Design a protein around this nucleic acid. Sequence first.
DNA 1: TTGAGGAATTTCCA
DNA 2: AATGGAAATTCCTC
Lengths: 276, 276
Amino acid sequence: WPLSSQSGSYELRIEVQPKPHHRAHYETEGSRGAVKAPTGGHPVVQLHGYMENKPLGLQIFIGTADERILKPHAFYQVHRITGKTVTTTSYEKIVGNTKVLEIPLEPKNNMRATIDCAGILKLRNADIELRKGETDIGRKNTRVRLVFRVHIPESSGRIVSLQTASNPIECSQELPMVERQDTDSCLVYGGQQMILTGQNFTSESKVVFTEKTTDGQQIWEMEATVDKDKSQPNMLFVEIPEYRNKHIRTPVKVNFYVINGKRKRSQPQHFTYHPV
Amino acid sequence: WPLSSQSGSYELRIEVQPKPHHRAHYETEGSRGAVKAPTGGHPVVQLHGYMENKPLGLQIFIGTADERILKPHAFYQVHRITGKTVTTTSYEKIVGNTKVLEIPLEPKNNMRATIDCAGILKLRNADIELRKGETDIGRKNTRVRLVFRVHIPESSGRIVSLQTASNPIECSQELPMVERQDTDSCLVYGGQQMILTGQNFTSESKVVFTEKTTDGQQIWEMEATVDKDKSQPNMLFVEIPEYRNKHIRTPVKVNFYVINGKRKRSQPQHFTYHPV
DNA sequence: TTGAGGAATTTCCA
DNA sequence: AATGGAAATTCCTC
């Protein structure tokens, strides 16, 4: 529905936001999986002020993230994952030019709902812009927001319709960047703390040290553990790794980079090791 | 023609081989240009033993590079560039399920021909494998060879058919990273050699030194020439540049970075200059 | 169209 | 079914 709503006398809140990224899939591919949450779980929606003992139907559809008139995204449609097992929530498929998922919000769970039945299909830019009426374009526009709605019936006969939107979700298959290093060196034993000040640093970021021969033959590689804290979206706390040879009589130049998965390595950062 | 030939009593030789790479184009795009030669010119084909004063027709078609039964490539077709001007050779378009270009080989030029009217179209994998008969596949198979043929008529009535093939031609279309510096300093005069050990280093890589005021106003910038060798995919040989002021009575801190085009600069690398 | 360089979508694989 | 990883084929832009 293009009309905007909010959170009237009660309140519909997203208790658990979905990961910032989520590669969507095409009709040409097979499901690319449900929208997952950073916690390794799934996003969670909850209706608070409801006291009655009647189950409502939470509605889920994919909407726009940028611009600003929250509306169904023309190039994305929620996908009903048929989790023969993994699925913890029942589903239903409706329409209105855009597909909508309806999951039950039951008081049994304190009107709380785990969303692990929602995927993200991606229609083909051409196929869309090709239909009479649409003026928006797909190109470069792949940000999305999960939209949740509930239609609360009050004994008085009225219908209160709340709605909420997740944070933005990138839906396309963005690398790390280091600007400053808390420390520049340390000695063989390691231990000392190094705080990296940069960008794109996510909870899934990794830091690895490496040493190469003047040619390029990497002879050393070791992952230095990041930190227990949520760190920061632009700050990492790395515990300098130990070295492979404490018995050095001259400092040793090495490198360390930040990586986010596979094809996501930051430029090599310089770091030296002083002999005992 | 699937049948193989060679170089009988005369000889058909490629006097100038085509560059190893050449991004081909789709019917969906516009010509991506004629096949060019490393010399900046174009490939050149020549028939030697011919003495008669009659022009023959050199035939050009795109064939397979790998495997080994030199044959028309099913996913590539020569493209007749309509060089309203740049074109130095006339052309003709034939068939046989595969398109063939026929350029004239005239004695005026010593039966020599400059090939600057040949491009490389790329049919769509699906569109091909979809036709009854073909069993080969496009996927990962994008190597090609320019094939040239001549049909030499001998007064005796016979027909001698020679043929030759260019070297293989790749037909298909990420910032630098410095991990180690061979040298750390040098003095004003420069000259000394510096070997950079990193990644992504391509033949088109450049190295520039720079100096800035504590604010950021860059007052010095000079490109230090790389090296004649193919260097390495992870190793560069830079000849330290000269400095702008030999008359310094104190060392000077400067920087140097590796760049691949425009938006491809590596982090600034530290380097100092000692006074005479 | 011609002629490319540089990406962003779609399709494909293991 | 669910994804991670790429090749392919469109798309922009000048």
